[PDB]
Amino acid sequence: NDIIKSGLAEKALKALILQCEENPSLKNDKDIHIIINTGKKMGINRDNIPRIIPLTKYKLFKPRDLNILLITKDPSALYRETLTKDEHTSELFKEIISVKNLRRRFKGSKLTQLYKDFDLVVADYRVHHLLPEVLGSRFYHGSKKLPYMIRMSKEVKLKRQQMVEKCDPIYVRAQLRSICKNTSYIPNNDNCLSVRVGYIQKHSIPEILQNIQDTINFLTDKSKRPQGGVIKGGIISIFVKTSNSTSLPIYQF
């Protein structure tokens, strides 16, 4: 909670918020990211699988707010029928598409259009590792729209047995609420790390400052491994920036 108390963090974010209003080039930059300088090499290769950081005090977003695309295993008839009919998940998804239907229909410039129209991409964990070839480089470069893996039903797979296929609407809605409200991060084999913490014009300065503390606690807490506690050896420094604005320091060791 020290990072909240220090006035520099408040001063930086106020400067950043004033800037995005003034400079035209930053008119389209809406997200606030924190750049954390891990002391040592984390040593985790970038697997392109987002890891969710629980933000307890506040919720970043609600699933209703964003365009959500669901990529399922073939056939999508079962999942599409189950999700669409159930009231809770009836309107939850902007579109539901199977992997092969995704590969066939969208290619080239269509892939770029898909990127603009959808704000969140979620896929069954089975088909996630196939997505990098299908979605393309634009989705998997920069981590803004990197897909989030989800599980359709609470059933588990066992050796030498066949997993029973089911779609559980209430379970599915539970994850997407977790995904949208909580922030996420992707490990990489270098000091740096970027985690979204707030959205400009929606989150007040205390909220962003509180969210930053949540990110620091979960990420340094060894008890939360393997999802958390990946920054071993302390943090040299933290910055705050938008997509195009520069790095403003908020904590230095």
Binding site: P50, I52, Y125, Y148, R151, I179
Partner: peptide, 24 residues
């Protein structure tokens, strides 16, 4: 929860909480 085919399930799974399950 772990799936032997996809080790990527275990890390970066969405945590599910009581508030999430409850309807709006």
């Amino acid at each position: 929860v772990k799936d032997h085919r996809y080790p990527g399930l275990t890390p970066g799974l969405a945590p599910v909480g009581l508030s999430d399950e409850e309807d709006s």
